[PDB]
Design a binder for these strands. Structure first.
Ligand SMILES: [Mg+2]
Ligand SMILES: [Mg+2]
Ligand SMILES: [Mg+2]
Ligand SMILES: [Mg+2]
Ligand SMILES: [Mg+2]
Ligand SMILES: [Mg+2]
Ligand SMILES: [Mg+2]
Ligand SMILES: [Mg+2]
Ligand SMILES: [Mg+2]
Ligand SMILES: [Mg+2]
Ligand SMILES: [Mg+2]
Ligand SMILES: [Mg+2]
Ligand SMILES: [Mg+2]
Ligand SMILES: [Mg+2]
Ligand SMILES: [Mg+2]
Ligand SMILES: [Mg+2]
Ligand SMILES: [Mg+2]
Ligand SMILES: [Mg+2]
Ligand SMILES: [Mg+2]
Ligand SMILES: [Mg+2]
Ligand SMILES: [Mg+2]
Ligand SMILES: [Mg+2]
Ligand SMILES: [Mg+2]
Ligand SMILES: [Mg+2]
Ligand SMILES: [Zn+2]
Ligand SMILES: [Zn+2]
Lengths: 186, 77, 169, 109, 117, 213, 292
RNA sequence: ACAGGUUUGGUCCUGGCCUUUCUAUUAAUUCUUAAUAAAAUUACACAUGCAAGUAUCCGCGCCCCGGUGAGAAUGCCCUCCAGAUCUUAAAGAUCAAAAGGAGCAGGUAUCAAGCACACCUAUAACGGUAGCUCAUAACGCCUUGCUCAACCACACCCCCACGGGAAACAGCAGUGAUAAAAAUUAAGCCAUGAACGAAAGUUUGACUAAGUUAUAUUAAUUAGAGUUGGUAAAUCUCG
């Protein structure tokens, strides 16, 4: 997995020179204009297909977030944006893996990207406001009161309840409703 | 959905809603809860109504509106 | 564009760039200009360059032009009140006419800036809609939230049919 | 204060095309329109009938139409307000003198 | 379109990618479809708890109350929402579901200790 | 130009044809509300009455059966509904002004009557039209008891007129007075004064929409 | 007394300390390029253009506000234990109303504990970041602020970038803001890299954190080595403004003061390494007698 | 378009046709599994089961969703709002019919004239003028949903439904006939939305979760199809 090595090798330096990877690679296609996105994968199982990408024709190359020397040559130097596969000629799989790679690269800052000057979020910052500063907690809180009388369950007059049964007499389902106060269970 | 002029199903015709069962505690509790609730919310509503009243008539008839009117008139002249 | 002798004025850029906006009172504008004289010279330019700027920015204001009726060139303005403005343009420079009009029935820069801000406040960051009106859409997108199954398939647990087959058994 | 007309026409100016009706003037209006392909401004014309008390409009007059608050007919929504240039007799708004074309008939002094 | 009647109503439209529901609080006509036309959008609600374990709810309190002051009706889940926030008093049915759930939890404690015995 | 020209004549015809026929087809309430008891079926409407409504229908009679034992129909005799009884201990009585019986050639049991009100002791002095004359929960009081019913009217002071604005809202008002520069620590009071709703048993006045000019 | 960053003295002294480098101020950026625009100008037009440049550069150069830390805000607006038994995960209620200043927004929570709690500061911010998305900000904290990534970015001498990252990502009164800004200052100090942030808008933070850490060493050394006397002058001036009563201040002031006397008396009265100052303050001095 | 092939013995020039890119149906050849979106030949005819109920009466709801694109150059955009409903201490709010018009709006001029398409009297339904539209396309004919956080139109046909043919799935599933065109006669109101309810709540073929299909993307467990003179990647031996 150790990235830096193969980019400084004499084998690599021999093969690719100081030109980027993919320089000499050329993608064969049906006409003057290549299909708008390259092949899905150039590797399925043990089989390497046709004339392989820059990246996967050479197995000793490793796509990571670590090697900046490999990921550099897939990003536009001046524009700092990546190339779409056809510019380069990499396969879709290695191109998605390359985008995701450059991301974690820039998230660990191993790479450069452009960082703009942003002003502060707020214009005038006053911590003073009542949303920020803790309010005068409710007169209802101080007492330990429910915020309203109806949060509290009140056992009703026996008159109202028996007249209520008197209303619904055939359909009444009557089972005691005192609300046990503490929740937890197995 | 169905329409006015679509016929009702046969299996539907003789079937009339059979009411749900009631509990005394639960019920009277709920009637009160809702009574107080709706009371409160109905108060709030009038507060918001008043709010929009204010915003509106203070936007149309506000001293700044007539200020603009007069200022602009004079400017024009 | 190729044809035309000052084709730059058949641009969109040339149209947006002209600055006069009209007050809400202006309805009609009447340009009376003259063909032959040295003292007409400015007025003509105004018709040839600036009239198509003006109009663009005020598509609801009729702008009419008469030739060689009156021996001296002028503008007229018909406001909502029945106020008739009369702007004498004679030895004036084209630029001078423009700026003079801007003075008389203009809009203060602050007015315009205010209005554009009052329209820009109409599209609110926090809403969710189609890409046309809003920015964000499903809240598939926003970071901490749940990824929407198109991109990232969901836990066996959270699927409907998992719950169904679990409640059945 | 309500007197209105739902029509955008509220004030226009047009030529006077024809006199053929009683106390009603046929007036052609012309506005500039931007042809989107060419990006150019051309003269689109539209005719408006208008109403006249005096029946004062000769053909060829440059006339100021004011929108009428309540429409008379399907085809009459306007009232002639003022005659801007009576034809063949034109008095210069600037100097208030009688004129033909480039020439004053009675000059200053 | 033109309707016979109905009221301005504040409710939950459902945008969702299916098994991942999400809602847009919306000021609408009762007689328009759920996901269709509305007057104005008010807030959103995200049911599914996020990375931090939270259910996000945005509301424009100023506008919400601008419409209630115009007499919009609230759907019951918009009232559950407004309840929790404390912009509105807690909804009665909430409390009842509380009592119900507590009673069932007590009954199930007793079932647990009657099965253990 | 946008120009669309087309006559529609039968657009009007049907309008007139229905309207006219409608008033000839206008069902008299005799045949309309008439009920089949062994079924609980409305012959005219084809509707089958609710399940909480069976018993009351079977055991008691509608207002204009017992308004028809009357010598005079304009009796100032107070009428009371069974449900109003069972819900409220304080007397709900409903008294008559103008009665129009619509004549079932058979039992003369239907009609539109117009009363005055007192609901659970709170008195309402103006004549309305009676709503729901149609239902069997109606009962009539004899002349001797009406003196026992009117005197049970009492008066008591109502529950609190003030309230604590809900937690977030109060928070916001407080924040706005503290940011505006009024530091008064006076609690956030709310008036329940105008919040009065009648109990759902209060019969809804049906005439039209009231216009305040 | 009342010294602070936004005082006119501290401001004008920190603007002069910072410096205008139109090459570092306006530098090639990585954005998609456009073809360059050309026009022919007079000497006059080029001068006016130059001043125009300098004016606009100032706005680019404006200092990011420094502020003290915020305290945690813990307040409960209400409690109903009845709700607690619902055992649902946390609810977060934000207000989005376009008129409001984001410190005046109301952000609230209901936990499974059946209580109404106000949002914490970090919480509050990531909320506003959700519904009022502002560029550069991640709603979940970006990895790069771990110590490893920090050191990696320092190695690459990118420090302007880090300090530009925190301005956007966090809030100026936050905890993390302060941790990262200050730790980053420590790095430029131990590496003597001070001239990095020189024409940057970040210079004000350099000056302040150090005057208040009372290590003026590297900046004075560097200033004298860079052949800038006036900056070391206004800097000691600053240590005197943020430390009015001390031996060094009142003595090396009221005795007498100017370039030589105040810089060398504050080189003797600030002892961190006074040997460094005294060395370099000799060298510059010597390099004058050869040049004049 | 970054263009490429193709007129002639050859050379330019002019000038079509075609290739090369992307999407969608349908077909042929192949085909492993998930997940997500989408699902459609047919305003042809329809077996059967369902798609509105609620509710102490009365009332309220009952093409609203949902379906379709048949019709109509329809219409977009912009004025102005009757009415219906909701809230309410009488004025707000949401839909918004009719009626309008700055401007924009399918083809065709081998459709060039249309044939009363105007106004004036406020007299109070009569009289008086002789007009109006139109080559800046009137009046025709032909084809057609759309400018899409939605809007327009239809609801068995006779534009309109009194009346007449005649007995209506262009609701969900299904089915004959037709067409190159093939989803379950499937489970739930558990979430949302809707209707009623004072309320618990009830109903909802909307919708939710499924089921079927390589129709499109994503992931892998899956290997096959087409090509190989040139444009245009790529060939040996036979017949
Ligand atoms: Mg030839
Ligand atoms: Mg040849
Ligand atoms: Mg030849
Ligand atoms: Mg060919
Ligand atoms: Mg197929
Ligand atoms: Mg539809
Ligand atoms: Mg449709
Ligand atoms: Mg068609
Ligand atoms: Mg047609
Ligand atoms: Mg046409
Ligand atoms: Mg309308
Ligand atoms: Mg022909
Ligand atoms: Mg006549
Ligand atoms: Mg029909
Ligand atoms: Mg019929
Ligand atoms: Mg049909
Ligand atoms: Mg079907
Ligand atoms: Mg039907
Ligand atoms: Mg078939
Ligand atoms: Mg198909
Ligand atoms: Mg079903
Ligand atoms: Mg599905
Ligand atoms: Mg596929
Ligand atoms: Mg196989
Ligand atoms: Zn590859
Ligand atoms: Zn999504």
């Amino acid at each position: 997995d150790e990235p830096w090595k193969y980019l400084d090798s004499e084998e690599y330096q021999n093969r690719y020179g100081s030109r980027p990877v993919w320089a000499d690679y050329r993608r064969n296609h049906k006409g003057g204009i290549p299909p708008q996105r390259t092949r899905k994968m150039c590797i399925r199982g043990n089989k390497v297909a046709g004339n392989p990408c820059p990246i996967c024709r050479d197995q000793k190359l490793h796509v990571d977030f670590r090697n900046v020397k490999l990921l550099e040559q897939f990003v536009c130097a001046h524009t700092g944006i990546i190339f779409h596969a056809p510019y380069t000629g990499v396969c879709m799989k290695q191109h998605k893996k390359l985008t995701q790679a450059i991301q974690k690269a820039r998230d660990h800052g191993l790479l450069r990207y452009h960082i703009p000057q942003v002003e502060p979020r707020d214009l005038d910052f006053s911590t003073t406001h009542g949303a920020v500063s803790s309010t005068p907690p409710a007169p209802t809180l101080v007492s330990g009161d429910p915020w309203y009388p109806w949060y509290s369950w009140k056992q009703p007059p026996e008159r109202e309840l028996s007249r209520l049964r008197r209303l619904y007499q055939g359909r009444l389902r009557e089972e005691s409703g005192p609300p046990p106060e503490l929740m937890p269970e197995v | 959905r169905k329409t006015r002029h679509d016929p009702p199903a046969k299996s539907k015709a003789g079937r009339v809603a059979t009411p749900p069962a009631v509990d005394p505690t639960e019920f009277f509790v709920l009637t009160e809860r809702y009574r107080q609730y709706r009371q409160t919310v109905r108060a709030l509503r009038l507060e918001f109504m008043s709010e929009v009243r204010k915003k509106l008539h203070e936007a149309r008839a506000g001293v700044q509106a007539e200020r603009k009117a007069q200022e602009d008139a004079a400017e024009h002249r | 564009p190729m044809k035309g002798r000052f084709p730059i004025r058949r641009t969109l850029q040339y149209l947006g760039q002209g600055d006069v906006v009209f007050k809400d009172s202006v309805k009609v504008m009447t340009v009376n200009y003259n063909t032959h004289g040295e003292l007409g010279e400015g007025a003509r330019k105004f018709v040839f360059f600036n009239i198509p700027q003006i109009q663009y920015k005020n598509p609801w204001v009729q702008i009419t032009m008469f030739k060689n009726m009156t021996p001296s060139p002028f503008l007229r303005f018909y406001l909502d009140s029945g106020e008739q403005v009369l702007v004498d343009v004679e030895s004036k420079s084209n630029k001078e006419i423009v700026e003079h009009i801007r003075k008389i029935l203009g809009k203060n820069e602050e007015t315009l800036e205010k209005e554009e801000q009052e329209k820009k406040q109409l599209s609110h960051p926090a809403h969710f809609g189609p890409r046309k009106y809003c920015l964000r859409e499903c809240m598939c997108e926003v970071e901490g939230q749940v990824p929407c199954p198109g991109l990232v398939p969901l836990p066996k647990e959270m699927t409907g049919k998992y719950k169904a087959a679990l409640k059945a058994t | 204060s309500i007197a209105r007309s739902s029509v955008h026409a509220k004030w226009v100016v047009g030529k006077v095309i024809g006199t053929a009706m009683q106390k009603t003037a046929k007036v052609r209006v012309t506005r500039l329109v931007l042809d989107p392909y060419l990006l150019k401004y051309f003269n689109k014309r539209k005719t408006y009938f208008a109403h006249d008390a005096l029946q004062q409009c000769t053909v060829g007059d440059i006339v100021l139409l004011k929108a009428l608050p309540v429409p008379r007919t399907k085809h009459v929504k306007h009232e002639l307000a003022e005659i801007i240039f009576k034809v063949g007799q034109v008095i210069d708004p600037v100097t208030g003198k009688p004129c033909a074309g480039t020439t004053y008939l009675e000059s200053p002094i | 379109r033109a309707y016979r009647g109905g009221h301005l109503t504040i409710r939950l439209a459902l945008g969702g990618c299916t098994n991942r529901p999400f809602y847009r609080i919306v000021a609408a006509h009762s007689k328009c479809p759920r996901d269709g036309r509305f007057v104005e959008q008010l807030g959103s609600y995200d049911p599914l708890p996020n990375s931090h374990g939270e259910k996000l709810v945005a509301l424009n309190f100023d506008r919400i109350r601008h419409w209630i002051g115009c007499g919009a009706h609230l759907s019951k889940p918009v009232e559950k929402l407004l309840g929790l926030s404390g912009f509105y008093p807690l909804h009665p049915m909430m409390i009842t579901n509380a009592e119900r759930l507590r009673r069932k939890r007590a009954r199930e404690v007793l079932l647990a200790s009657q099965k253990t015995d | 130009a946008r120009k669309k020209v087309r006559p529609r004549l039968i657009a009007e015809l049907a309008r007139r044809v229905r309207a006219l026929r409608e008033q000839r087809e206008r069902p008299r309430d005799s045949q309309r509300y008439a009920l089949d008891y062994e079924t609980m079926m409305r012959p005219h409407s084809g509707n089958r009455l609710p399940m909480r409504a069976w018993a009351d229908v079977r055991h008691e009679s509608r207002l204009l059966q017992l308004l028809n034992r009357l010598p005079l129909f304009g009796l100032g005799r107070l009428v009371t509904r069974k449900s109003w009884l069972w819900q409220h201990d304080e007397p709900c009585y409903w008294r008559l002004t103008r009665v129009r019986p619509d004549y079932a050639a058979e039992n003369l049991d239907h009609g539109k009557a117009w009363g005055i009100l007192t609901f659970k002791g709170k008195t309402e002095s103006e004549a309305r039209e009676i709503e729901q004359v149609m239902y069997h929960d109606w009962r009539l009081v004899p002349k001797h008891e009406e003196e026992a019913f009117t005197x049970x009217x009492x008066x008591x002071x109502d529950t609190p007129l003030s309230v604590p604005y809900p937690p977030l809202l109060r928070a916001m008002i407080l924040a706005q007075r503290q940011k505006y520069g009024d530091t008064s620590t006076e609690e956030p009071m709310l008036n329940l004064e105008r919040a009065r709703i009648d109990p759902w048993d209060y019969p809804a006045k049906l005439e039209a929409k009231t216009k305040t000019k | 007394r009342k010294p602070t960053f936004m005082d006119e003295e501290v401001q004008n002294i920190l603007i002069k300390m910072t410096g205008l480098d139109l090459q570092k101020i306006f530098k090639p950026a990585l954005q998609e390029l456009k073809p360059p625009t050309y026009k022919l100008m007079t000497q006059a037009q080029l001068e006016e253009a130059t001043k125009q440049a300098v004016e606009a550069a100032k706005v680019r150069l404006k200092m990011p506000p420094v502020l003290e830390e915020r305290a945690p805000i813990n307040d409960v607006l209400a409690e109903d234990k009845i709700l607690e038994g619902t055992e649902t995960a946390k609810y977060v209620f934000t207000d989005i109303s376009y008129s409001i200043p984001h410190r005046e927004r109301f952000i609230v929570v209901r936990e499974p504990s059946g209580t109404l709690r106000k949002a914490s500061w970090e919480e509050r911010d990531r909320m506003i970041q959700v519904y009022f998305p502002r560029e550069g900000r991640r709603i979940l904290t970006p990895v790069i602020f771990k110590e490893e990534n920090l050191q990696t970015m320092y190695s690459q001498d990118q420090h302007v970038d880090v300090l530009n990252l925190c301005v956007a990502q966090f809030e100026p009164d936050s905890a993390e803001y302060i941790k990262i800004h200050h730790h980053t200052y420590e790095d430029i100090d131990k590496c003597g890299k001070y001239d990095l942030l020189r024409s940057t808008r970040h210079f004000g933070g350099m000056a302040w954190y150090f005057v208040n850490k009372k290590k003026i060493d590297g900046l004075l050394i560097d200033q004298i080595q860079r052949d800038l006397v006036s900056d070391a002058t206004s800097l000691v001036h600053l240590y005197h403004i943020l430390h009015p009563x001390x031996x060094x201040x009142x003595x090396x002031x009221x005795x007498x003061x100017x370039x030589x006397x105040x810089x060398x008396x504050x080189x003797x009265x600030x002892x961190x390494x006074x040997x460094x100052x005294x060395x370099x303050x000799x060298x510059x001095x010597x390099x004058x007698x050869x040049x004049x």
